[PDB]
């Protein structure tokens, strides 16, 4: 399934998507991606829209 991440970091902004077997797996992908790009923020996830957000 496609999952989406909305980025609202201090300097990293925009959107990315990933193909994952479940939301827990997508969460791990996105949190690793955010960490690796220096984003340390607050997270939401909406299971109806398959969308994660991270905000600094």
Curated annotation (Swiss-Prot):
Q: Repeats (sequence): which ranges?
A: 2-56
Locations listed in the record? Secreted, Cell wall
Q: What is this protein called?
A: Immunoglobulin G-binding protein G
Which organism's genome codes for this protein?
A: Streptococcus sp. group G
